[PDB]
Amino acid sequence: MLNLAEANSIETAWHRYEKQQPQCGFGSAGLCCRICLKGPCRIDPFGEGPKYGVCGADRDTIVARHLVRMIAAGTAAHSEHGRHIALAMQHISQGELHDYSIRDEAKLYAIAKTLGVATEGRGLLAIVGDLAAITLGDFQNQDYDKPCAWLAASLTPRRVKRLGDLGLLPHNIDASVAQTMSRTHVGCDADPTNLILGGLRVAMADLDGSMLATELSDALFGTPQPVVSAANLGVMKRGAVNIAVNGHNPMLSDIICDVAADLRDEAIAAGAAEGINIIGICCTGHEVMMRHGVPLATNYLSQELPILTGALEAMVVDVQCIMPSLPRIAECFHTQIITTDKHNKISGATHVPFDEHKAVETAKTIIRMAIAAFGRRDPNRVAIPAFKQKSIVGFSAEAVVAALAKVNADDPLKPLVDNVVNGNIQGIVLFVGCNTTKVQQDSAYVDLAKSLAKRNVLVLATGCAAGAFAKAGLMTSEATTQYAGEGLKGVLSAIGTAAGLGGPLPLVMHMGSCVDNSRAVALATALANKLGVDLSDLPLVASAPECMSEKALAIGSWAVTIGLPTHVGSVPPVIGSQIVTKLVTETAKDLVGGYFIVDTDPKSAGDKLYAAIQERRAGL
């Protein structure tokens, strides 16, 4: 926890959770079913109740069909973000979408290198078209046996073989989601094993979306490089127009950032002495935190609380992980919750649609409204907590290897590799996932982080996990000296002073939004290649102690298919099926290297994670 801005008149996410107590144990068990209108069909595993549904389907085919349908939804969620980015890149290539451009042409040529596109003497718009045509191809191929272009280009070669031999390499992101929906229909795919393999194949179609999203978003806006930022509710200035950007797509926020600069004088004119101060919520808040250093107000669960300070002039949303309660809560104040997307309206908000073509003028309209919301701000109701915590963020996979080249420009990975074979770094944990109410907010992350840090493992974080470490200052050079542990701290401070920081590198390491989890794969696959090996051999581990979204389920599943022991700290609906639970814990260990780790205890989970790393080290 952290802030505690007591409503005392208003329902919040914590209130609505307790009024749901107790929650249906059937659904939490995975023994609920509503796929056809002959249900609802439940399974009584014990006292001689119904052991089958009207379908004839058992507990295992019921639990599994819902597992992969959840993975499929999270894949559809991530892929819709990457599709907008690739559709842009196709418009940038055709002299259209003028408000956008290739702001990082260095990242663009490197993307075309990993994809095989010629760049020598070709001109920018030709490469961009070759890059958009390929990336759109992953959304339209019908040859079930042709892997996704980004997957084949971006994994280790050993992994590409392992999955293609099992048919786990997707051919089409849209078709993977749709073929998962169709096969889980009433009376279609039954076999729990065929089902779970079908969820792992569509989990890879999520990885594709996350890769092409991160890479082409860099080329659109710039690769993150280390920057100083600040987190928590304190970053709201009373003397400023406070604009919260919540959602996922930086195509809106990165434009709002630039327009917020030229529009400062209108903020001062309306009576805001400190201009307009835009703040970030959730993954779009991380995108502009990663890139431009814009502060991060809060992560997921505490996203209604900015309106509670009585000084949020407008919260601009687009898609995903935004709470439908926000038009209700903002009606008690002056706040303007502004929806933007064609496929993301909240009843009671204010919709201004984002014409990507007319981008910077739609921004002005948005900021003009929030300047006018400042006009109706009640001044004796402002109550901003003074919690602002600083954090060094912007640690893209590119920048991390750059700071290593301040230690060895010849072999930039050699310090990392050498410091692993000797034990200063026992391993790497990547903290992923959102916020759940069945885990005390931010506590499981911080418990796990310092426990594993102390054990000499490097911590990387993304999304609402990096947001939970951002606040509570584990993203500081000081957090490294206090909790790292000697061997881990010795290296962390070496690179930390090689690149001009001021101390060591922060304990945890921001890599960005959930799609930017593809950065750590790029980090790890290059490592796995330097050693001439695969990720199912590296002392590498993922952990989602507080996960909820279907994205978190899809993200975690391809973390298994890639080779990582993946810790889940919020129990998916599998416990009702011992057979499915065997499939993802055992069996996965053998087929695909990675495996799941379901533990609700942050202390005992970090014991299995270190054990997984220590077992992983032994294999070398």
Add this chain to the structure above:
Amino acid sequence: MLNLAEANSIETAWHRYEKQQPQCGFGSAGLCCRICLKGPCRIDPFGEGPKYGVCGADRDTIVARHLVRMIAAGTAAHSEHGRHIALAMQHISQGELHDYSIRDEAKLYAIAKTLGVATEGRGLLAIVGDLAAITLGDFQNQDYDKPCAWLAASLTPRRVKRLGDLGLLPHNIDASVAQTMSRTHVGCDADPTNLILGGLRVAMADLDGSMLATELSDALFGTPQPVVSAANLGVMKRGAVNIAVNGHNPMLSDIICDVAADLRDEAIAAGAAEGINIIGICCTGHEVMMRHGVPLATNYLSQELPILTGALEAMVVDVQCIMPSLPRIAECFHTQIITTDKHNKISGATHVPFDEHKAVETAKTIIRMAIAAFGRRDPNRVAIPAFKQKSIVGFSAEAVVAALAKVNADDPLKPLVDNVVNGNIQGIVLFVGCNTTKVQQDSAYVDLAKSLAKRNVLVLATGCAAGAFAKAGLMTSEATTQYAGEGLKGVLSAIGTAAGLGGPLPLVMHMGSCVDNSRAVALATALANKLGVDLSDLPLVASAPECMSEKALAIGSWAVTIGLPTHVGSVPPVIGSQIVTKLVTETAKDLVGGYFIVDTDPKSAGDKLYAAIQERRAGL
């Protein structure tokens, strides 16, 4: 009904249904969300308790989001069928796939006239090459404002403009299923009106898949023409090896049927003096019956009873509506449940994969596995009820027009309209639907047809609904002379005796499988184009007295969006929201012209349907 193989000590669909009593009711009203792993949050409508989910979404977001995902899983189910035909038509245009070919070169040409393929002096394979490309574009177009190819080309140009101006013409089948699962992810679309409107678009994609599948499948296997067949379990033979074909895809069955004939001389040699008995279950059987007249054993709920006869040697199952209990109901006997699709495997059943490049060869293998099970049939455990109801089927839209051309070959549609303005044909009804255990099998189907036919309205049917009418004897000439009203019986008898068949046209005309519901919208659009109107003005109505599947919910949802008053007889999860209910029942009569009629009383349904039929006659 009528058969019911009351078998002792074996569990069936009805036995498994009654084990589930009572079923949740929260899920029946749609007041259980189940998306985000912080739930399952449920809504209490009356006595205090929880009024929201933890994300903050009200009952109307929870209800709308689940309905819209059922529409998407139903579109994915049908679209995957259509994509198989389209890929086959592409291997066909290139010289791959030597077992399949353009059997109805005629159909191929009329499919190309409309939809705009140029034919003038062009080889057949160039014409079917353009057809394969255009149709595959409906699965890969990324221009959001580019309507689907078939949709624009196939339904009335007035409805093209309406749905276009409402934004309901889909641009891509695969991306409509995906953008649906994404926008219904946690924290995404929440406005009830927006969600159900987006579900109306992913429903118009099920019309696309159904359209291309039906039309293209005809060119590959032949456009159905009137054929006499037989229905019910009495279609099995003890002196023949009985092979059942369940599922949906005709690409398998049509082969199996042809190969069975060439493999008759090996059957008799093994002891099957009557050869290969290929019986049909669900839609695969409907496809081959409509085209070749093969017998249909049963529909959905009674697909396990053919095993109880002790005379089923194999059940070759491909995709969709295949009960997972069948492998368990075998073993008890000698039957071989044989799965074929890589995305449709059932634990305990024998899987031999179906390569379409090696269709006939695979076919022979399957059939041989059954002629081996014939030599394992316990002859002391045979029990074929001997219910063989003769059925006249094969009534494609083309066949209907031809019969109306045997009376007026200059204005073939004039006999229809004239008899609708005078009153002899008060209207038409399309009976779609499956089979649910909450309504006695086939009961409401039969009752609703007779009550309406007496009121002088033509009865058309598809799928398991048509199977119910076939096994009941409403698909014969005598049924018209008995239950049809005077005016209707007159027109039917005239066209009949004028188009051979020596009698009146069947009371219920078999229009085909689920995808063949596009034949009814074809006939309707043609009549509406002869009268200068839209389907929203024709006295046309759809009814699903025993729906249960997601495909049916989608099949009914595009019927509403094309302008048809649709009746549902199983109550979708919608009662929990009066807003969503009103949106799909009342405000749809203002936006898209069609609407839903939830009743569940078969008597009150027909009264309301006839009221709508007569209301459409007020106009015109």
